[PDB]
Amino acid sequence: CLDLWREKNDRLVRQAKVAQNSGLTLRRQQLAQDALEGLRGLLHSLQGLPAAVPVLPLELTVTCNFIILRASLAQGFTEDQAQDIQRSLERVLETQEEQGLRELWDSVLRASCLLPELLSALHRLVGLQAALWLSADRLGDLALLLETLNGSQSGASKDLLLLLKTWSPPAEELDAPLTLQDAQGLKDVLLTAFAYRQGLQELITGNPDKALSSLHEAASGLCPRPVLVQVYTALGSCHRKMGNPQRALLYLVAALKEGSAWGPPLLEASRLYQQLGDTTAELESLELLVEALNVPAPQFLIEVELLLPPPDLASPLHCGTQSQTKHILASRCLQTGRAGDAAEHYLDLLALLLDSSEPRFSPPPSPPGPCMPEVFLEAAVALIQAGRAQDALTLCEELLSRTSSLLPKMSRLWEDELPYCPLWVSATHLLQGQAWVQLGAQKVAISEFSRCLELLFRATPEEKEQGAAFNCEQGCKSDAALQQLRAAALISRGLEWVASGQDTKALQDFLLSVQMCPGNRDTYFHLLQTLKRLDRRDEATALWWRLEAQTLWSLPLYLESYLSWIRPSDRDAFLEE
Amino acid sequence: RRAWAELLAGRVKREKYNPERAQKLKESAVRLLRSHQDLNALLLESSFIGSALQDQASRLGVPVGILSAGMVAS
Amino acid sequence: LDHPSPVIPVDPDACILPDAALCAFTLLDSVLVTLVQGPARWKMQLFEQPCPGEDPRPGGQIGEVELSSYTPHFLPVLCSVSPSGSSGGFTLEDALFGLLFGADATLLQSPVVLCGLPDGQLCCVILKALVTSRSAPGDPNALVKILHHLEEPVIFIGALKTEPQEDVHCDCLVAFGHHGRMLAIKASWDESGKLVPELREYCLPGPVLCAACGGGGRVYHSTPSDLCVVDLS
Ligand SMILES: [Zn+2]
C-alpha cells in the first residue's frame, strides 16, 4: 500500500515539476490543479488510517508538497495550510508521544530530540510554517520556535537574523520520498525575505542607517534580479534620506542596468533631484519615467516575491501607472512656473483619461491626490498662466456640462448655508472669470465672480449629513480651501471694480476678504493700496498694527497656483513702506 | 462640443511600445544620471565604485589603474 | 456556438482563467470582471478580453481589489451599470448615476459594478479606478463602496424605466432579498433645491426564488407558491 502511495506522491511531484518547467499559461495551471487534486486525495488516503512511524515521513512529504503547490497557485499563505500543518503535527505527536502550534511545536521538537529518522521532513515543515508566520507577520514566536530548534542557552539572541543564520538544514536529504523543495532552498528564501522586510520597515519608520545592513544582507546571496532592483532602489532611498547623493545615484544606476522594470529608480531619482533643486533634471527624469511605464512566470515553488509584502504609499517602491505619473509631471511642472509645458501635459492627461473607451484603461490619480474635477481645474489654471484663456473656458464649460445633473438648481438663489454645493463648482466660475479678465471683459468677469461668491456664502460644501456617493475626502471639503477661495474671488472682483473706477465697492470687497482670511496678506496689500490712494494715514496704520499682531497647511493646487498667479511681486516692498 | 475634441484629438500617441526604442530610452536615462555623477565626491563619501571607474576607463580608453590612482591622489 | 449524439463534452482547451475559486462573473464591452472566494476576504478582479476576433483568451489582470467588508449556498451577483454616452448590463440616467456614484464616474463616463453578497450588502466599484499592479496595490476603503445593507441575501439587481411616458435609460435601481426585502432607489431633487435619493425598502411576501425586469417598471418574481409581478410605475 505504501509503495503505491509513495509512487503516487512521486508521480504527482514529477507532474507538478513538468508543469513548472514546460507548458503554456493554461496547460501549466491545468496540470498544477490536477496534481493538487491528486495530492489532496493522497493526503485523504494517508489520513484515513491511524498512521504509524514508517507511514509518517511519506504523509509529511505529501503534506509539505501539498501546501507548497497550494500557496504557489493561490499566491499567498493563509490558515488552511496552518491547520493542515496542525493535522500533520498531531499525527506525529499521537504516534509516539494539541492546544496550539507553539507548544505543539515545542513538544514535537522534544519528541524529535529522541531522534526518529524524519528530521529532514520536520525541517521542511518548519521552513514552510516559518514562511507562513513571516507572510502573516507573526515575527515574535518564530524566534521562539527556531530558538527551541537550536540550543536553548542561545535564548538571549532576540534578533531573528542570527537565529535564522544558525538554523541549519539537518541532512543531505538521502533517498526519501521525493519533494518539491529542500529546507536549505527555503532557508535562503526566508533569509532574503526577512532581511528585505526588516530593511524596508526600518526605512519607513525613520531608521535609514539600520536599513543598510539588512538590505546589504538581502543583496549578498540568492537575490533574483527583480528583487535586487528593489533592494538597490531602497538603498538609493536610504542614502537620499541621509544626505549622500552620489552613493544613491550609483545604486540607482545599478538598478537601471540590472532591471527590466526601471520605474521606481527614476521616481527616486526625481525625489533626489528635488532635494538638490535641479528642477530641470527632475522634469527630465519624469519625462523618461512616463515613456518607461508606457511598455507593459508563476513557478510551482516558494520564491521570495510570494513572501514580500505588497508595498505602501510611504515606500520608495510604490510606482503608479503612466497616468498617475503624468499627473506628477504636470503638477510639478505647474508648481515651478513652466505653465505652458504643464498645459500640454494636462491636456495629454485628460486625453488619456476621457479617450479611454476601447483600449486598456488608464486610471485617474488615487483619492489621497486630487479628485477628478480638481484635475480639470488645475488644467485650466495652467492654460490661464500660459495665455490660453479661450481653452480654459472650454475646459470649464465641458466640466459643468458633464456634471449638470449634479449641480444644484440655484432656486435658493431666488429664495434668499443650508444647501449643498461642492467647492469645485464655485472654483469653476472663478477660473471662468479670470479667463474673461485676461480676454478683457469686465462685465461678464464680475458676473462670474459674483456667481462664485453666491455659491460660496449661500451654500455649504461640508454637508456630510447623508453619505450618498463617492466624494472628495479632503480637497473639496477643507475650510482652509473655502476661506482662501472666498478671499480669492473677492480680490479678483475688487481688481475689476478698481479697473472700472468703483473704489468704494473695491474697498468693501477687500475689507470683507480681510475679515475672512486675515493670514494671506494679499488682502492687506490690496486694501492698503486702495486706502493709500483715497485716505492714507489713520486706517493704513490701524491695519499695519493688525498685520504685526498676526505675524499653506494643505491646500489644493488649483487654488495655490491661482493665488501665486494673481499676487503682485511688489508685496513686501510695499508692506514695509 | 467641437473645440474640446479639437484640443484633445492630436494629443494621444496611442501606445508606441517598440521594445527596440525601450533600450534607447534606458541608455538616455543612464546618460542623464552619469552626467550628474561626480566620482571625486563619490570617493569622498564598493565593487559598484570599481565598476564606475571601469566605466570611466572604457570611456577614456585608459587602463583602470591610471585613472584609479589619479582620482585617489586628487 | 458554431462549434466545428447531440451531447458534446467540453474539452479543457476552452478553460480560460482556471481560477478554481471564482464564484461569480460578468462581462462588459472589452472587459471581464470576476469575483473570487478565498479565506475571509473575497476579492474582485478585472481582466482584459481581446477586442479582435482571435484565440479566445482572458488577457492579463488589469486590477484586483479585496472586498474587506465581507467576512464569511447563496452565490453573489454582479451587475454592470453604465451611464448615457459610454454590453449586457443597464444604462442608467445621468441624475441617478451622479446621485449614486458621483462626479468621478460621471466625468470619466465609467461603467460601475454592483456586487450583491450573501451578507446582503450591495457594493459599488468604479472600473476606471480599478487599475492596479504589484507596485500599485488597490486600496479597498477607497475603491469599493457600499450603497445599502439589506439584512438578508441578494437574488437580483436590476433597473427599470419607470415613467415610460433596446437601450432604455433606466430611472430606478431594484434589488431583492431571499426573504422578500425589495429595495428601489430613484432621483427626487425635492424640498430644499437639492438632489436627494428616494429609497423604499418594501417587504413582499415569500422566499423569492428568482426575478426579472419587464417593460415599464414591472418586475416578474417567483415564490414557492406562484409566479407574481410587481409594478413600480
Ligand atoms: Zn475634490
The three state secondary structure string of A444-499 is: HHHHHHHHHHHHHHCCECCCCCCCCCCCCCCCCCCHHHHHHHHHHHHHHHHHHHHH
Q: How many CB pairs under 8 A join A and B?
A: 76
Phi-psi region of C134 (alpha: psi -120 to 50; beta: other; left: phi over 0): alpha
What is the sign of the dihedral through the CA atoms of A190, A195, A201 and A205?
A: positive
Q: Coil, strand, or helix at residue C109?
A: coil
Q: Which of A42, A50, A317, A100 is nearest to C137 (CA)?
A: A317
Q: Which three cell numbers stand for residue A71?
A: 500557496
What angle separates helix B19-36 from helix A279-294, to the nearest 10 degrees?
160
> What does the DSSP 8-state code read for residue A567?
S
Q: Which residues are paired to C53 by β-bridges?
A: none
Q: Is A142 on the interface with B (CB under 8 A)?
A: no
- Give CA separation, C191 vs A412, A419, A484, A532, C2, in Å: 11, 11, 31, 49, 57
**Rg of chain C's alpha carbons, rounded to an integer?**
19
Q: Contact, A288 vs A210, CB < 8 A? A: no
SS3 content of chain C, % helix, strand, coil (to 5): 10, 40, 50
Give the span between the Cα atoms of A299 and C200, in whole angstroms.
52
Which residues of chain C does A411 touch, with a Cβ-Cβ cutoff of 8 Å?
Answer: 193
Q: Contact, A47 vs A6, CB < 8 A? A: no
Beta strands C154-160 and C144-149 are unpaired
Collect all residues from B whose CB is shorter than 8 A from any CB in A: 3-4, 7-8, 11-12, 14-17, 19, 22, 25-26, 28-30, 32-34, 36-38, 41-42, 45, 48-49, 52
Q: Contact, C105 vs C126, CB < 8 A? A: yes
Give the minimum alpha-carbon distance from A25 to chain B in angstroms, rounded to a whole number.
22
Beta strands C169-170 and C90-92 are parallel
Between the CA of C104 and the centroid of ligand 1 the distance, in Å, is: 10
Q: Report residue C169: phi and psi, to 5°.
A: -95, 90
What is the sign of the dihedral through the CA atoms of A232, A237, A243 and A246?
A: positive
Q: Which three cell numbers stand for residue A280?
A: 530641470
Q: How many CB atoms are closer than 10 A to CB A474?
A: 14
Give the span between the Cα atoms of A133 and A130, in whole angstroms.
5
First-to-last C-alpha distance (Å) of chain C: 38
Give the minimum alpha-carbon distance from C86 to chain A in angstroms, rounded to a whole number.
8
B37·A398 Cβ contact <8 A: no
Q: How many CB atoms are closer than 10 A to CB B66?
A: 11
Task: List, as ranges, residues 147-166 from C with C-beta within 8 Å of A.
Answer: none
Nearest chain A alpha carbon to C20: A33
How many residues does the structure list for chain C? 233
Give the minimum alpha-carbon distance from A289 to chain B in angstroms, rounded to a whole number.
9
Give the span between the Cα atoms of A99 and A105, in whole angstroms.
11
CA dihedral B10, B14, B16, B17 (to 10 degrees): 160
> What does the DSSP 8-state code read for residue A131?
H
Residues sharing a CB contact under 8 Å with residue B11, sequence separation 6 or more, in sequence order? A347, A348, A351
Nearest chain A alpha carbon to B16: A294
> What does the DSSP 8-state code read for residue A405?
G
Residues sharing a CB contact under 8 Å with residue A280, sequence separation 6 or more, in sequence order? none
Q: Which helix (H) or strand (E) covers residue C91, if one does?
A: strand C90-92
Give the minimum alpha-carbon distance from B13 to chain A in angstroms, rounded to a whole number.
9
A394·B4 Cβ contact <8 A: yes
- Give CA separation, A4 vs A8, A22, A40, A42, C175, in Å: 6, 26, 15, 10, 54
Q: Report residue C110: phi and psi, to 5°.
A: -90, 130
Question: Burial, C128: exposed, middle or buried (Cβ in 10 Å; 0-12, 13-18, 19+)?
Answer: buried
Q: How does DSSP assign B36-72, residue by residue?
A: H--HHHHHH--HHHHHHHHHHHHHHT--HHHHHHHHH
Which residues of chain A does B32 touch, with a Cβ-Cβ cutoff of 8 Å?
Answer: 281, 284-285, 288
Q: Which residues are paired to C214 by β-bridges?
A: C218
Most C CBs within 10 A among A305, A372, A425, hence the mutation to make, goes to A372
Q: Which three cell numbers stand for residue C182?
A: 425589495
Q: Report residue C91: phi and psi, to 5°.
A: -95, 115
Residues sharing a CB contact under 8 Å with residue A550, sequence separation 6 or more, in sequence order? A518, A519
Residue type, A208: P
Q: Is C51 on the interface with A (CB under 8 A)?
A: yes
Q: Contact, A541 vs A531, CB < 8 A? A: no
What does the buried/exposed string (b/e) look like for A64-93 if buried means 16 or more CB atoms within 10 Å of the residue's CB?
bbbbbbbbbbbeebbeebbebbbebbebbe
Give the span between the Cα atoms of C49 and A408, in whole angstroms.
39
Residues sharing a CB contact under 8 Å with residue A537, sequence separation 6 or more, in sequence order? none
- Give CA separation, A217 vs A44, A183, A214, in Å: 41, 19, 5
Give the span between the Cα atoms of A345 and A351, in whole angstroms.
10
Give the minimum alpha-carbon distance from A467 to chain C in angstroms, rounded to a whole number.
9
Q: Which three cell numbers stand for residue A492?
A: 479678483
Give the span between the Cα atoms of A576 and A564, in whole angstroms.
20
Question: Burial, C6: exposed, middle or buried (Cβ in 10 Å; 0-12, 13-18, 19+)?
Answer: exposed
Q: Coil, strand, or helix at residue C222?
A: strand
Most A CBs within 10 A among B2, B6, B7, B51, hence the mutation to make, goes to B7
Q: Is A266 on the interface with B (CB under 8 A)?
A: yes
Give the minimum alpha-carbon distance from A247 to chain B in angstroms, rounded to a whole number.
6
Between the CA of C109 and the centroid of ligand 1 the distance, in Å, is: 17
Q: Which three cell numbers stand for residue A104?
A: 505543539
What angle separates helix A503-516 from helix A522-534, to the nearest 10 degrees?
150
Q: How many CB atoms are closer than 10 A to CB C226?
A: 8
- Give CA separation, A120 vs A60, A83, A123, A133, in Å: 10, 21, 5, 20
Q: Which of A65, A73, A80, A62 is nearest to A33 (CA)?
A: A73
Q: Contact, A64 vs A101, CB < 8 A? A: no
Between the CA of A231 and the centroid of ligand 1 the distance, in Å, is: 36
Which residues of chain C does A468 touch, with a Cβ-Cβ cutoff of 8 Å?
Answer: 99-100, 196-197
> Which one of C86, C103, C193 has the shortest CB-CB distance to A408?
C193
Residue type, A173: E
Q: Coil, strand, or helix at residue C159?
A: strand
A355·B32 Cβ contact <8 A: no
Q: Which of C27, C32, C65, C30 is nearest to C47 (CA)?
A: C32
Q: Which three cell numbers stand for residue C192?
A: 430644499
Q: How does DSSP assign A407-454, residue by residue?
A: S----HHHH---SB--HHHHHHHHHHHHHHHHTT-HHHHHHHHHHHHH
Give the span between the Cα atoms of C114 and C145, in whole angstroms.
10
CA A376 to chain centre: 23
Which residues of chain A does B52 touch, with a Cβ-Cβ cutoff of 8 Å?
Answer: 250
Q: Which three cell numbers stand for residue A522?
A: 494679499
Between the CA of C84 and the centroid of ligand 1 the distance, in Å, is: 23
B45·A246 Cβ contact <8 A: yes
Q: Report residue A499: phi and psi, to 5°.
A: -60, -35
Q: Contact, A241 vs A249, CB < 8 A? A: no
Which residues of chain B does A350 touch, with a Cβ-Cβ cutoff of 8 Å?
Answer: 8
Q: Which three cell numbers stand for residue A412?
A: 435658493
Q: Which three cell numbers stand for residue A359?
A: 483600449
Q: Which three cell numbers stand for residue A575?
A: 508692506
Q: Is C127 on the interface with A (CB under 8 A)?
A: yes
What is the sign of the dihedral through the CA atoms of A318, A321, A326 and A327?
A: negative
Q: Which of A491, A494, A429 is nearest to A456 (CA)?
A: A429
SS3 content of chain A, % helix, strand, coil (to 5): 70, 0, 30
Q: Which three cell numbers stand for residue C177?
A: 432579498
Give the span between the Cα atoms of A526 and A510, in whole angstroms.
7
Q: Contact, C230 vs C216, CB < 8 A? A: no
What is the sign of the dihedral through the CA atoms of C133, C137, C140 and C145?
A: negative
C39·A360 Cβ contact <8 A: no
Residues sharing a CB contact under 8 Å with residue C222, sequence separation 6 or more, in sequence order? C208, C209, C210, C211, C228
Q: How does DSSP assign A171-192, residue by residue?
A: S---S-S--SS-HHHHHHHHHH
Residue type, C73: H
Q: Contact, A87 vs A47, CB < 8 A? A: yes
Q: Which residues are paired to C160 by β-bridges?
A: C172
Most B CBs within 10 A among A295, A350, A360, A402, hence the mutation to make, goes to A295
Most A CBs within 10 A among C94, C104, C189, hence the mutation to make, goes to C104
A273-276 LR contacts (CB < 8 Å, sep 24+): A273/B36, A274/A332, A275/A240, A275/A245, A276/A245
Q: Which of A352, A364, A483, A377 is nearest to A432 (CA)?
A: A377
Q: Which residue has the cell 466599484?
A: C125
Q: Contact, C209 vs C222, CB < 8 A? A: yes
CA dihedral A322, A328, A330, A336 (to 10 degrees): -160
Q: Coil, strand, or helix at residue A149?
A: helix
What was the experiment behind these coordinates?
Answer: cryo-EM
| The Cα angle at residue C45 between residues C42 and C50, in degrees rounded to 5 | 155
| The Cα angle at residue A419 between residues A416 and A420, in degrees rounded to 5 | 140
Which residues of chain B does A284 touch, with a Cβ-Cβ cutoff of 8 Å?
Answer: 32
Give the span between the Cα atoms of A179 and A159, in whole angstroms.
31
How many residues does the structure list for chain A? 577
Which residues of chain A does B46 touch, with a Cβ-Cβ cutoff of 8 Å?
Answer: none
C15·A367 Cβ contact <8 A: no
Give the span between the Cα atoms of A383 and A334, in whole angstroms.
10
Q: Which three cell numbers stand for residue B16?
A: 508606441
Q: Is C53 on the interface with A (CB under 8 A)?
A: no
Residues sharing a CB contact under 8 Å with residue C118, sequence separation 6 or more, in sequence order? C72, C73, C74, C75, C76, C153, C154
> What does the DSSP 8-state code read for residue B74?
-
Q: Which three cell numbers stand for residue C169?
A: 435609460
Q: How many CB atoms are closer than 10 A to CB A570?
A: 10
> What does the DSSP 8-state code read for residue C124?
E
How many residues does the structure list for chain B? 74
Question: Do chains B and A meet with 3 or more Cβ pairs nearer than 8 Å?
Answer: yes
Q: How does DSSP assign C6-49, residue by residue?
A: ---PPPGGG--S--S-EEEEEE-SSEEEEEE--SSSBEEEEEE-
Residues sharing a CB contact under 8 Å with residue A163, sequence separation 6 or more, in sequence order? A143, A146, A147, A150, A154, A157
Q: Coil, strand, or helix at residue A349?
A: helix
User: Any alpha helices (H) in A295-421, and if so which ranges?
Assistant: 322-336, 339-354, 372-386, 389-402, 412-415
Which residues of chain B does A322 touch, with a Cβ-Cβ cutoff of 8 Å?
Answer: none
Give the minimum alpha-carbon distance from A30 to chain C in angstroms, rounded to a whole number.
7
Q: Report residue A392: phi and psi, to 5°.
A: -65, -15
Maximum distance among all Cα pairs of chain A, rounded to whole angstroms:
108
Q: Which helix (H) or strand (E) covers residue A279, if one does?
A: helix A279-294
Residues within 5 A (CB) of ion ligand 1: A 371, 374, 472, 475-476
Q: Which three cell numbers stand for residue A43?
A: 493526503
- Give CA separation, A419 vs A475, C49, C188, in Å: 19, 44, 15
> What does the DSSP 8-state code read for residue C225?
S
Question: Burial, A334: exposed, middle or buried (Cβ in 10 Å; 0-12, 13-18, 19+)?
Answer: buried
Residues sharing a CB contact under 8 Å with residue A575, sequence separation 6 or more, in sequence order? A521, A524, A525, A528, A547
Q: Contact, A268 vs A252, CB < 8 A? A: yes
Which residues of chain B does A273 touch, with a Cβ-Cβ cutoff of 8 Å?
Answer: 36
Between the CA of A475 and the centroid of ligand 1 the distance, in Å, is: 4
- Give CA separation, B70 vs A479, A541, B50, in Å: 61, 66, 14
Q: Which residue has the cell 465581507?
A: C70
Question: Do chains C and B meet with 3 or more Cβ pairs nearer than 8 Å?
Answer: no
Q: Contact, A255 vs B50, CB < 8 A? A: no
In this complex, the chains that touch B, judged by 3 or more CB pairs closer than 8 A, are: A
Give the minimum alpha-carbon distance from A221 to chain B in angstroms, rounded to a whole number.
15
Q: Which helix (H) or strand (E) covers residue A120, if one does?
A: helix A119-135
Give the minimum alpha-carbon distance from A279 to chain B in angstroms, rounded to a whole number.
13
Q: Which of C232, C165, C194 is nearest to C95 (CA)?
A: C194
A321·C130 Cβ contact <8 A: no
Give the minimum alpha-carbon distance from A444 to chain C in angstroms, rounded to a whole number.
26
> What does the DSSP 8-state code read for residue A309?
P
Q: Is A278 on the interface with B (CB under 8 A)?
A: yes
Helices (H) and strands (E) in chain A — how many of each? Answer: 27, 0
